[PDB]
Amino acid sequence: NPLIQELTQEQLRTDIPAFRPGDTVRVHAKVVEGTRERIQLFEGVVIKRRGAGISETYTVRKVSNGVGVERTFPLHTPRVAQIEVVRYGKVRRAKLYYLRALHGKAARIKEIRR
C-alpha cells in the first residue's frame, strides 16, 4: 500500500463519472478485427464494484434475443472511450445478483431524477 499507491498514480483515469450499482450505462469498447477499429455499444445495469484502486471492475447486463449476456470491465483501461451514465434507480443492495431468475416486467428498476 505505501509504494503501490505511489507506483500507480500514473496509469489511472480521471474521466470517470459517479455511478452506483443499479445505473444504466453505455460503454464504448474498442474492437480489433484484423486492422479495423470499431466502437461497439453495450447497455445494461451496473451490478458490481470491486473496490481496489488500480484494478476496480464493474459489470453490465444485456438481455438480447432472449439470452442475457454479461460483461465485466475493469475501470482504468485505455480501450474504453467513454462511460455514459443514462439513468438512476432505487437500489438497496450493493450487489444485485438476484436479477438472474427474473424475466422482463418483473425485473424493472425505478427512476430517481438525480
Binding site: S64, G66, V67, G68, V69, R71, T72, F73, T77, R79
Partner: protein, 122 residues
C-alpha cells in the same frame, strides 16, 4: 466446463433441441471444454420433421457457455445458457438460421459461415 453427459442446446434450423455429449475430441483424456471446441454427440429431443432425428452420432460446436473466456484486454463474458451448432466436418452448419448471441472467439477458429449467420457476435 462441459463434460460427458451434459446437456446443451441447439440453435439451428435442424430439428433438434437438446443433446448429450459423448466425447470432448482432441487429446488423450481431456476433461472439459470451452467456447469454440468440437463435440461428438447424440440427439435426444426433436421437433417433428427436420433433417436430423434422434439416435444419431452428431458432431457439433459449443457456442456461449455459462463460463466464458478471459481476453487479453482483461474483460470477461458470462452467458446464461449452453448451446451448440451442428457441423458437417467442413466447419459448415447443417441448418440455415442461428438464434441468439454468439461469442467472438469462433472467428479465431475459422467458423466464418457460422459467424456471418449469427444475429450478433459478442
Amino acid at each position: 466446463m462441459i463434460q460427458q453427459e451434459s446437456r446443451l442446446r441447439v440453435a439451428d434450423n435442424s430439428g433438434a433441441r437438446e443433446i448429450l455429449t459423448i466425447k470432448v475430441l482432441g487429446g488423450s483424456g481431456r476433461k472439459t471444454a470451452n467456447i469454440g471446441d468440437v463435440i461428438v454427440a447424440t440427439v435426444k429431443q426433436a421437433t417433428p420433421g427436420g433433417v436430423v432425428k434422434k439416435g444419431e452420432v452428431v458432431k457439433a460446436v459449443i457456442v456461449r457457455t455459462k463460463s466464458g473466456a478471459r481476453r487479453a484486454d482483461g474483460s470477461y463474458i458470462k452467458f446464461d445458457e449452453n448451446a451448440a451448432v451442428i457441423i458437417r466436418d467442413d466447419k459448415s452448419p447443417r441448418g440455415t438460421r442461428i438464434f441468439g448471441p454468439v461469442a467472438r472467439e469462433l472467428r479465431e477458429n475459422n467458423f466464418m459461415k457460422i459467424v456471418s449467420l449469427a444475429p450478433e457476435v459478442l
